[PDB]
Design an enzyme around this catalytic site. Structure first.
Site, PDB file in Angstrom:
ATOM      1  N   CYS A  76       0.856  -1.215   0.000  1.00 56.06           N
ATOM      2  CA  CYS A  76       0.000   0.000   0.000  1.00 56.06           C
ATOM      3  C   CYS A  76       0.884   1.254   0.000  1.00 56.06           C
ATOM      4  O   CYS A  76       1.408   1.570  -1.092  1.00 56.06           O
ATOM      5  CB  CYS A  76      -1.003  -0.050   1.158  1.00 56.06           C
ATOM      6  N   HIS A 160      -3.175  -5.875   0.762  1.00 55.00           N
ATOM      7  CA  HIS A 160      -2.577  -6.413   2.015  1.00 55.00           C
ATOM      8  C   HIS A 160      -2.616  -7.939   1.971  1.00 55.00           C
ATOM      9  O   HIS A 160      -3.562  -8.592   2.419  1.00 55.00           O
ATOM     10  CB  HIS A 160      -3.305  -5.827   3.245  1.00 55.00           C
ATOM     11  N   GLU A 162      -0.966  -9.857   3.740  1.00 62.85           N
ATOM     12  CA  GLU A 162      -0.753 -10.234   5.162  1.00 62.85           C
ATOM     13  C   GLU A 162      -2.097 -10.414   5.891  1.00 62.85           C
ATOM     14  O   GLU A 162      -2.140 -11.181   6.894  1.00 62.85           O
ATOM     15  CB  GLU A 162       0.153  -9.234   5.880  1.00 62.85           C
TER      16      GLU A 162
END
Length: 185
Positions: A76, A160, A162
């Site tokens: 990001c 993202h 993650e």
């Protein structure tokens, strides 16, 4: 071990947590940590630039993107940093599942379907890719969901991987850690 530059965002713990899940040690460092310090540790085999609220509180990330010899994944604000650092175009907030389309068999997306849902905010985006970068993924609302420097191990994602709501998020981390010398049986 992977070094995670804390750009001040909400999902930094999540980058650490998710790396641990797939077997990859990681250390969160303040984003003012000098590149020399990062690469002087012989245990470090790559660098993640985290998400964060403000591009101006993360300007150290520019020197790192330009000059690190290790692989880099920008997430990001991390992706937007890689873009400005190499003379590309960034410009103008809530989090949702975005349908992302993979462009043309890049390693970043090995074992990922041609479409998948990605946890993203598009507060900002890369408006124009730096010269000598290629686009790796897009959606309906964002032309540059992922990118890579054509000649350097430097990767950029707007979303993202993650956060567990990202389909194949752990496969995208495996693919990036593969570039940092890790193997996932």
């Amino acid at each position: 071990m992977i070094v995670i530059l804390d750009n001040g965002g909400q999902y930094v713990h999540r980058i650490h947590r998710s790396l641990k899940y797939i077997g990859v040690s990681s250390k969160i460092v303040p984003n003012t940590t000098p590149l020399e310090e990062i690469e002087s540790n012989k245990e470090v085999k790559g660098i993640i630039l985290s998400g964060g609220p403000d591009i101006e509180k993360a300007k150290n990330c520019i020197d790192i993107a330009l000059n690190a010899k290790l692989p880099i994944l920008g997430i990001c604000l991390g992706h937007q940093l890689i873009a400005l650092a190499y003379g590309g175009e960034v410009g103008r907030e809530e989090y949702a599942l975005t349908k992302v389309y993979v462009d043309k068999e890049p390693d970043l997306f090995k074992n990922v379907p041609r479409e998948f849902n990605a946890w993203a905010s598009h507060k900002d985006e890369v408006k124009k890719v730096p010269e000598g970068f290629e686009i790796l993924a897009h959606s309906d609302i964002c032309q540059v969901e992922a990118m890579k420097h054509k000649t350097k191990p430097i990767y950029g994602v707007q979303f993202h991987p993650e956060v567990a709501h990202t389909e194949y998020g752990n496969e995208i981390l495996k693919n990036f850690c593969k570039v940092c010398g890790y193997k996932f049986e």
